[PDB]
Amino acid sequence: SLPREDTVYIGGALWGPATTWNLYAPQSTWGTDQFMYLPAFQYDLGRDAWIPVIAERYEFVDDKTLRIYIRPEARWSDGVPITADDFVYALELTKELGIGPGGGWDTYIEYVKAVDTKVVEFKAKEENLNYFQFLSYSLGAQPMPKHVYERIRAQMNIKDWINDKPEEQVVSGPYKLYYYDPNIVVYQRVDDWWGKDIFGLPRPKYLAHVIYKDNPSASLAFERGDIDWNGLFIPSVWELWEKKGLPVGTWYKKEPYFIPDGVGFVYVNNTKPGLSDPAVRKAIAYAIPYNEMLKKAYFGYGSQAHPSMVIDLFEPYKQYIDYELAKKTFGTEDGRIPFDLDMANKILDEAGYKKGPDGVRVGPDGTKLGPYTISVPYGWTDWMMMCEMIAKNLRSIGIDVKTEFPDFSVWADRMTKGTFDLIISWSVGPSFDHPFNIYRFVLDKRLSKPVGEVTWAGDWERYDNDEVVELLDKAVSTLDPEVRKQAYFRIQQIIYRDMPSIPAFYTAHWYEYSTKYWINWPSEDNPAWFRPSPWHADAWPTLFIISKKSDPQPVPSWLGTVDEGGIEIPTAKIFEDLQKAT
Ligand SMILES: OC[C@H]1O[C@@H](O[C@@H]2[C@@H](O)[C@H](O)O[C@H](CO)[C@H]2O)[C@H](O)[C@@H](O)[C@@H]1O
Ligand SMILES: [Ca+2]
């Protein structure tokens, strides 16, 4: 039924059934945040710049008070202007509900205020001044249609609202839900999208995502032409074009094939007995067969993460790693953790864990390091294999771990509510504020929630440490790189001592394309957007760059910095402005 050449078929982004289209619900559906709701400004990792999207510009009143001016054209899909009240509303709702976009804003933002119809003002909290979070929450604030949400709240609990009626859906992005059922989710373009004159219309009229049960079935679909825009783990992906001559590609045409997405962790629930012991978590770190698993199970699509949680694939981040502490701690040339069952057993022995007759460790207090599961979603075959290789090694050191692979939604439920034992999951990636972002996401108790309550915002492992809080509250009280640095280095000491969870590998930014119906995909040859994976939070510009094969169109002129004749503002220009307002 869908017009094939006017539709982008997608894979690897939606796993399990659709849920809601409500970022305030416990779970929501792929596409909701990506395409339905846009921010004031879109961070562009590729260029280290910011696209003014819903906002046309900012002004620092002073260094702690930022005003953001909404484009006059910015307008919800129902014709109601997007206004400052929508910005205030979205954030206040998140604080009230304990869930929603911009979780944690109130920790570092003193107030968000609508100073006029199209003018929002954000003010940094000065007690725990943090310029990075001040900028992050404000520039990337996503408004929500207050006039919509208020009426829902009159009628039911917000957290229960589904938002699944297409004709009632009210969005800021260029797409909204068209149709769904147990086997597919489909979005349709908003042809009179407010952003049409500034940004153009995205070329696909439809985004469709057939719900595949597992990797092999999605891959088969991709091999046969049925997926244009894929975000999948695929084994030996190069074979698709090198051997099978299919019209498909990836970012790179040779080894890594994928750019990095972020840091994949073996998360260890700190609230469970045994797993609550830093010694046990440290022993787990030495028992991960990093290289063999990344080579065999991950196909070299990504490499071992540094234990500082800093993504050292990028030269600019390396200054934030205390290499002398890491090398001294782990005895390796760059300070990575070696796979070493001897050390793993040694750590366990020197903490007084002793194998019982069944081979499973018991601690000096009688805690058995056993039955635990390590879990990832069913059908995520790369992660499943990695789980099996990890679980085998843990068992041999007397930590009784078995794999379990439930439906994505079940897995997500246990992850977010902190009822898992071990999992592999994601965290965050390269960003203007990186390494801060990952410490904030993984280690900060203030973004967690009690066991049994959902968090998407951070610290699934329920790590609890007041010192980290204090260091995050201090790390960017001034813009002096050296101050960040020292806070980062101290957090690193704490990480090596507590091993809150294990940074294991750099996740791949899964991204594959077919040129059968759509061309001008972003790639190393055509590096127009650096987050093109269909599931990425920041995927949307990809849809403005591709063209129908039957009608090639040039790359949008708004891409590129201001000095290149685009509309994007360098991060350096924003800090220059911040500085200048001091
Ligand atoms: O590599 C693990 C699996 O990753 C899947 O993509 C994930 C997205 O759907 C998810 O929501 O975001 C994470 C961030 O790490 C992605 O890894 C692939 O679709 C699967 O094929 C793959 O096995
Ligand atoms: Ca969004």
Author numbering: 1 to 582
Sentences from the paper on this structure:
The periplasmic binding proteins (PBP) are a protein superfamily that serve as primary receptors for a diverse group of metabolic solutes in signaling, chemotaxis and metabolite transport systems in bacteria, eukaryotes and archaea. PBPs are comprised of two α/β domains connected by a flexible linker region that serves as a pivot point for the ligand induced hinge-bending motion that this protein superfamily is known for. Unlike other PBPs, the tmCBP binding site is bipartite, being composed of a typical PBP solvent excluded disaccharide binding site (subsite one) that is adjacent to an atypical large solvent filled cavity (subsite two) where three additional saccharide rings could be placed. The structure of tmCBP was solved in the presence of β(1,4) linked sugars, however the size of the tmCBP binding cavity and molecular modeling suggested additional glucan sugar linkages could be accommodated in both the disaccharide binding site and the solvent filled cavity. tmCBP is found in an operon that consists of an ABC transport system and an endoglucanase, the natural substrate of which has been predicted to be the algae-based storage polysaccharide laminarin.
The crystal structure of tmCBP complexed with LR2 was solved to a resolution of 2.05 Å by molecular replacement using the previously determined tmCBP structure. The overall fold and conformation of the protein is similar to the structure of the cellobiose complexed protein (all atom RMSD= 0.4 Å). A total of six tryptophan residues (Trp15, Trp380, Trp383, Trp426, Trp510 and Trp535) form van der Waals interactions with the two sugar rings. In total, ten hydrogen bonds can be formed with the first sugar ring. All but one hydrogen bond are directly formed with the protein, with the C6 hydroxyl being ligated by a single specifically bound water molecule, W20. For second sugar ring of the laminaribiose, only the C2 hydroxyl forms a direct hydrogen bond with the main chain carbonyl of Gly12, which also forms a hydrogen bond with the C2 hydroxyl of the first ring. The other six hydrogen bonds with the second ring are with water molecules.
